[model samples]
Target: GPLHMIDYKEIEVEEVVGRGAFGVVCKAKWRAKDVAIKQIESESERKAFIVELRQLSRVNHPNIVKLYGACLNPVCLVMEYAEGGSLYNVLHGAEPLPYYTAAHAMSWCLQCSQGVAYLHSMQPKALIHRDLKPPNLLLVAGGTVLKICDFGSAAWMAPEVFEGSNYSEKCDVFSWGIILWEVITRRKPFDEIGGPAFRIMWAVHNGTRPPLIKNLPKPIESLMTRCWSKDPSQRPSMEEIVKIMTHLMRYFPGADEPLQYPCQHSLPGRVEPYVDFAEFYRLWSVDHG
Candidate 1:
């Protein structure tokens, strides 16, 4: 009764690339191209997918994963295979990306936010990425392109979503703020709570987020702080984020290069945040993998 048009015989399952609370994601070969197949075996598993299929069927963007099709008998979602693993792993790798590479690596953050901006642009309606994390952000192998994935999720959704009153797109801004922190510092968010996916939920509600680093380029630092605000309305829209980040990245030469970030003092009376990074390094990460 589902995915009636797609045939499993045309797809060949390869290896499992990742897993979540609902099921495992497998790397598969279909039509001679690599694709990811997310297994859906339960009601909860199917829920997020319902959101994905409906949303992605109409969404098209370079920074967003392409939805190929699906296999219903086995109940799996077919998506583009991200061979480079994830941004989360890339940040935690043994070597820091070459200093020259840091700016462009951070450029990936620009691209991801661009993808979110696109979603926020939906005419007459907007979509929220219930789950926005590095694990959900995929990298194009050997390239700077980053794709946003896994828009389906029932937990850690925007704070307003859980409150039962009303929810808006600002939830994504909060998540993006955390993401910006991880990308710039290559550190994990609230890493000390161990691996419980839900543990951070209470902390988030309590207004506790990873320390906003003071050492990052000032413009970027200011953006991150606004994104982490407990008051959703205070956060910037994706469009504003895109414009700001795009402007900020122009001066950064990705390879052993230098980038220019404008100083707030020059703007006069502009808002800027000076959060302490003294505790930033001590924040730990819990790898969901």
Candidate 2:
């Protein structure tokens, strides 16, 4: 059986908020509160919908997206809408936001780590978010809190699954390293050098690393390096990442103000822009409505 229509049409669709490969997200007003409605393209998208719902249903945290409900009949999922949208959008728009803004963003990143860390501590199995990036990290209205979303690619590592060697929590760490670089540099991971494959190749052959932002707090810089370590074992755990980010947040004076940093000359070998947040949001609205 398949859901042919969504029942929540009663709610008013405010604006197009986000769009992904499989779905379009809209800002809607539901029961007097703002909500985000995610409409899947087809039943094939149900796997991710079901997986994310099941995962969020069991785990409760302020930093993770709050699952409101779903329309199984029409294959749509709903959750609380984040006003500021994705960190990817905030980073690319206008001028670079303040350093304290980056610090505040880092706090949300720590929160994401905490949520994932809780998953790793689960009893029978551990959960890993195979994809972690700025676009997946969202900011609540007012731009203070960060919530990790898009768990469609997540995997729970049971004993059998772990023994197979197909995936590991280390993959999440590697992704986090990319995201940590995004937050500090206000640039998309691998966007500077090339796509993921090219960046990986470059890192392997040329010892290339993410461009460093000068005058960043020492601890934060050290933490980013640790996350990006080639040896996954050497990478810091989510627990450690949270602790370090928390400490760095204190060094930042204001949570709202942007940080000041000198601009660097662009490197010669810039890669194709894989995804631009502003353009994504704009096109997403047109397709869904």
Candidate 3:
């Protein structure tokens, strides 16, 4: 594992930024820099978190949030802080992109595809991010960049997982479809935004998906349909996803221009619960809100 061992005394914890089943993820200052610290509360948690940390530490991609180091004193993993918060709130706050919004949705999907592709294309072993929902996608580089975060939920687990069989990276490709669809339509899958888990699982199992957008770019439309296919084998690999996203992104409105991405903003101390829309869309709002 590429993880570094850090001293517990060096990190100064601020308020809670996010919470998960195992523990809390806090906004903290480490080595005089902002970082997100995931704490492991128990012996079991430390054991399990160690595994995830090891796997994550090996990943180095601009589109994937960085994991700086881990500490055993209280079992904490320090990670790159994504100030703009989760993509769930980002998508929910903005209009479907390309047609509307400052930065095109093509770039958003491209960034995501790049991140997911990196994880799946790892050498020796491939990583399937079982959880791949909007909330796990965090915005950074002032909304111009989106990075995937949070592995606790397995929010994007594959159908094979429930079937008592080994699953592959295609499960993540399946999730990529859901996330991409959510972005294209600016709504949750199955139009059941905030619906119960059982219902969502039932719908997924039954081959039900969100409604289609007839206006989507042909390549993007094809990728979405392929990702949501019933057979895992029918899905395209994340590696292929990267090439597709790259091809589609080249046709954006300002593809040939020196386009300026949104600028980063400082968050007020009172922001809470999770990702805030007004803050996430501040730069986008300035452009075309």
Model 1, residue 284: displacement in angstroms?
A: 32
* Candidate 2 residue lDDT tens string, 170-288: 76765676676666555654454554453445343343566666554456568777766655677778777767666655544345543344333232232322122333234435665
Residue pairs with backbone atoms closer than 3 Å in model 3 (clashes) = none
Instruction: Write candidate 1's Cα lDDT for 78-160 as tens digits.
Output: 88888866776665644433221445555777888899999988765688776788878887745467899875232224556
The CA lDDT at 289 in model 3 is 57
Q: Give lDDT per model, in order.
A: 0.68, 0.61, 0.68
Candidate achieving the largest TM-score: 3
Residue 21, candidate 2: alpha-carbon lDDT = 76
On the 0 to 100 scale, the lDDT of residue 162 in model 1 is: 60
As a whole number from 0 to 100, the lDDT of residue 286 in candidate 3 is 58
Model 3 residue 284 CA deviation (Å) reads: 24
Comparison by TM-score, 1 against 2, better one: 1
- Where does the lowest 10-residue lDDT sum fall in candidate 2? 152-161
The true-structure Cα RMSD of candidate 2 reads 11.2
Ranking by lDDT: 3, 1, 2
Compared with the true structure, the alpha-carbon lDDT of candidate 2 equals 0.61
Candidate 3 Cα misplacement greater than 4 A, ranges: 51-54, 93-103, 151-157, 191-195, 253-289
